[PDB]
Amino acid sequence: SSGLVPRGSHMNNIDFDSIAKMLLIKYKDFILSKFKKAAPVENIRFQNLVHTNQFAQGVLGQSQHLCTVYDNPSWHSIVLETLDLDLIYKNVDKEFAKDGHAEGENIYTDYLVKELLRYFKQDFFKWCNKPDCNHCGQNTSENMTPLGSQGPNGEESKFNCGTVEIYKCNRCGNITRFPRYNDPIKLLETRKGRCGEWCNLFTLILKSFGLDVRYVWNREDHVWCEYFSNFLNRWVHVDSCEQSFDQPYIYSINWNKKMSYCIAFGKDGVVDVSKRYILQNELPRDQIKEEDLKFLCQFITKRLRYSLNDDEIYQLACRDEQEQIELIRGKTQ
Amino acid sequence: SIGLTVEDLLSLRQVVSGNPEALAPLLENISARYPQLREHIMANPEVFVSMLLEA
Ligand SMILES: *[C@@H]1O[C@H](CO)[C@@H](O[C@@H]2O[C@H](CO)[C@@H](O)[C@H](O)[C@H]2NC(C)=O)[C@H](O)[C@H]1NC(C)=O
Ligand SMILES: [Zn+2]
DSSP: OOSSOOOOSSSOOOOHHHHHHHHHHHHHHHHHHHTSOOOHHHHHHHHHHHHHOHHHHHHHHHHHHHSSTTOOHHHHHHHHHHSOHHHHHHHHHHHHHTTOOSOOSSHHHHHHHHHHHHIIIIIIOEEOSSOOOSSSOSSOOTTEEEEEEEOOOHHHHTTOEEEEEEEEETTTOOEEEEEEEOOHHHHHHHOEEOHHHHHHHHHHHHHHTTOOEEEEEETTTEEEEEEEEGGGTEEEEEBTTTTBSSOTHHIIIIIOOOBOOEEEEETTEEEEOHHHHOOSSBOOOOSSOHHHHHHHHHHHHHHTTTTSOHHHHHHHHHHHHHHHHHHHSSSOO | OOOOOHHHHHHHHHHTTTOGGGHHHHHHHHHHHOHHHHHHHHHOHHHHHHHHTTO
């Protein structure tokens, strides 16, 4: 018969499944390379940028105070001792009762977070603009006039305190003071304060149920949490003060706050989360070359992970990437 | 080379890190819409993969 040239059946049926499975392989090497070394090249870039720019030094400093700090068994336990777990887990269970989605697919975790918000706000912790008068009754703050601020005394020095706001009671003459602590275990005792300490303690609380948690910092003086919902598998915005669960617009639209930057901090990394929150009344970002900020985070996130293993380094990097696309785009998924 | 849209570069990153099951059919759809990358794929996929690893 031939040579006529046999046709086969179909042409180059170009194998994607081959080339797809291949790549995923190649990618992983690309990723595991990225999160390596700290080649002294980009090291100066860092050591240096932290001197060009204070918004840099600002994030660097905070990373140091905020990423590792809430991973502390000793603490986690104390908080757990201290909270009313019976009550929390009862209500969480009661709300799981009234069905928790068709797929109860780690949804429990979300119902827990939500109920912690409620306990914290309705029950546990209490807001404090001026303090009540230590000698006069409880409900009694608006007859306190403030005589400024000053350093901690011996006792309150223990609890990582910088400023103690002092106040005079016009109805009795005694001086209630309001130390401003950073030791979140102290807060468990005092059970009162402002966004600030509200947030300090609430981050720790979330961390004590072994959730994956973050401290979000808005440069225009507010602070809150991000928690990772395996059921929504993305980060979810948690603000304890407003007993709010998935409402990142809250600030920008409901409050009509104007904001410029938002930064997350956690054991696993530091990430610019502005785009989640600053969705109108945008202020000029005029603090740091956007290129440099990207770098800054990446270098800290990278540093934060030398002692992780290849499976960890990768699974994390993907979560991050899933985030970028969420922020870069306008939506979830 | 290489140039694909920002929107694709996104949905590529999206899946190659988040739904790798769908990486094949997305590559289907790219050679679908980009002639000159249907040529690079065949002519050598190993270059096409490493070019691709540039976004
Ligand atoms: C300080 O943090 C608190 C707690 O979220 C904020 O108090 C909210 O203020 C907004 C602005 O109008 C109101 O919508 C809410 O009613 C307030 N919370 C409550 C119930 O007190 C305050 O806005 C924060 N300061 C800022 C914006 O930096
Ligand atoms: Zn008094």
